[PDB]
Subunit: 211 residues, 4 copies
């Protein structure tokens, strides 16, 4: 819709802050000081990888006019077996993963991506984030089923105590099992829109976590 | 009105900028390099002085339930003859005035305050801003008359080429005479509300000018 | 080292957030649901009153070249017996005090201002913040002079459970006695500089609390 | 020197604005009212396409330990003949190109990418940006190799009046030939780092242009 040519602003607006519990990686690490090794988990897409390139390619290739590609097995086979070569790792994830390896934590990736016959995503993550064998676990492809949070049972089964993610379902999955859900900002150039309201559950949101 | 307990945010919103032509004092000075002395002008209230203390006192004393104090001669006599001892000079004004003195410009103050029998505001300004006799001019008390911009004729008469102010009428007074109107941000703790939309005429707005 | 004429910016900087635990008045109220009436406390200067007008006048009048006015009984007698008529109440304080009065909480003000023979600050506060007799308490002048008690000691004595303040010492006083210290932003046009780093101890900071 | 665990902030910092000449697409369009059809130009990378996915893949694949991939013809052949299928078009570019097409302007793309035997980038751009045949022009590969012309020379040759770009060199190329250089923000998740200082030459910078 049209809007004023010169909208202007004012210093109340310029200074205005949403009441969000922002945290840093250093603050998270400090909050865990002395805690022995435990399981933690990460969403993948827009949490540790900017994977829009593959999802964008998939949409254009398989369903230019809809979201049907996301239920298309042919898309998932491409997405999970090499299109992540184009996925850009997020610095926030490098920092979190390093921190959790430092702690001796077991690292899980729990994604709403659909399972495929083979997958190279686990290797991509281990390689890009320099995750040792002992801390690494194969990616859990939990899928996406409207009406159910497919991640919650996985967080319970793996006794995941902190779950990082960009989407509301990541935070509520953590809430479902009494884990600590921590929000990462989805980048504004992500093709997955609209952007979620980070902090909408009163959860911690990591500063500067869009890259 | 009520609003969500946890509203959240997103990185598009966090990065979002209004299309405003922000400038610095240094940029203004540079834009004038080589220009010989000329007349420039300043609004007073929320431009060079945070004078809300006196206006706040005036409202409480003379019309706690209305804006009638602003048409009350007894208020103006107090406001213009000592209540500016409580008015806090703005750093942006110190910087602009110093810059204009450096240039050899003639400095005018054009205020919508009502004229009084005597006034000590001119002395307050000369003293607080260290304005030499040659650059200083007595404050012009132009008053406030709905339906008229009382400042425009003054800017014309004094051949003022740049006019600084926080209010829309300051900018449009400059526009009226073809002067360069430059916006200063009104502080968010000013008692003069609502805050104006700085930049709403496509004018330059000085960064960080709320203090 | 250069402060370039055209410094530019980038979107990392534009979106950058300090890791602050921001909260709203509504969130604080929510945290207190079902809690019986209790004592709460406020610092005065830059917490509930923008009192810089009086402090500015005091400095110019009594020690233009130093900070000695703050040790000058002549200044304090003026500051505590009427110059607060020029102090601007903060909206954040209106909201907090209203919320606490509604809870049936006792309202205390604990200030580091030097004590005087008489003071009219208590009345100024009760009048401006519409504090009912049953919730109102005379201002406490805390400090390190003989016969005085510290802010910490007074918080302990009055069983103050939450203490609101803009300075580091307000937060540490609360924490020394196991009270909840909550930070209010000092306005950028305050004459008390430098501005504190709100959130420096990981405490809650109230959003938009500069006005 | 310390990066404190709890750094805090203050309202001067929160409200702080860089002195940038921000503009909107609507403001640019307004500035062109009544101007006949003309040639305009765009840089490609981080201006119209977030092409970091291909550049990221290229670096990992061809020079994981250096920047040598950018001198590797094998990389450029991949980058210019299909890896842009994974590049994410920028909304700011959709708006600008739409606006310019509506004006009947000629659309040029002038890139510093190394030239290849064949390229499919022109088609990618025409398809994604819905650029009609009459407005579309094949991508120009500019540079300093033998037989090439510089960006400046091409802007001169094609009578390009406005040039959009994210890098300093895009702005200076425009200015060297008297064209209007307008800056687009590079996304913070770009792999081309450090981010430029948008506005470093006092040029117009498009608001919200990181996506
Ligand atoms: Mg995700
Ligand atoms: Mg004014
Ligand atoms: Mg205080
Ligand atoms: Mg570029």
């Amino acid at each position: 819709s049209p809007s004023p040519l010169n909208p202007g602003t004012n210093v109340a607006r310029l200074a205005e802050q949403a009441p969000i519990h922002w945290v840093s990686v250093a603050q998270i690490e400090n909050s865990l000081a002395g805690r022995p090794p435990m399981a933690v988990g990460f969403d993948i897409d827009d949490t540790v990888l900017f994977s829009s390139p593959g999802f964008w390619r998939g949409k254009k290739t398989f369903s230019p006019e809809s979201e049907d590609y996301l239920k298309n097995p042919v898309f998932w086979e491409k997405m999970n077996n090499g299109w992540d070569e184009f996925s850009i790792p997020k610095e926030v994830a490098r920092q979190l993963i390093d921190m959790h390896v430092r702690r001796g934590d077991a690292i899980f990736f729990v994604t709403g991506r659909s399972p495929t016959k083979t997958e190279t995503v686990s290797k991509t993550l281990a390689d890009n984030f320099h995750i040792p064998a002992t801390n690494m676990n194969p990616v859990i492809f939990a899928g996406d089923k409207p009406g159910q949070n497919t991640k919650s049972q996985w967080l319970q089964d793996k006794n995941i105590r902190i779950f990082y993610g960009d989407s509301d379902n990541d935070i509520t999955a953590a809430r479902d099992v009494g884990a600590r859900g921590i929000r990462i900002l989805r980048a504004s150039n992500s093709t997955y829109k609209p952007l979620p309201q980070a902090g909408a559950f009163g959860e911690e949101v990591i500063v500067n976590s869009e890259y």
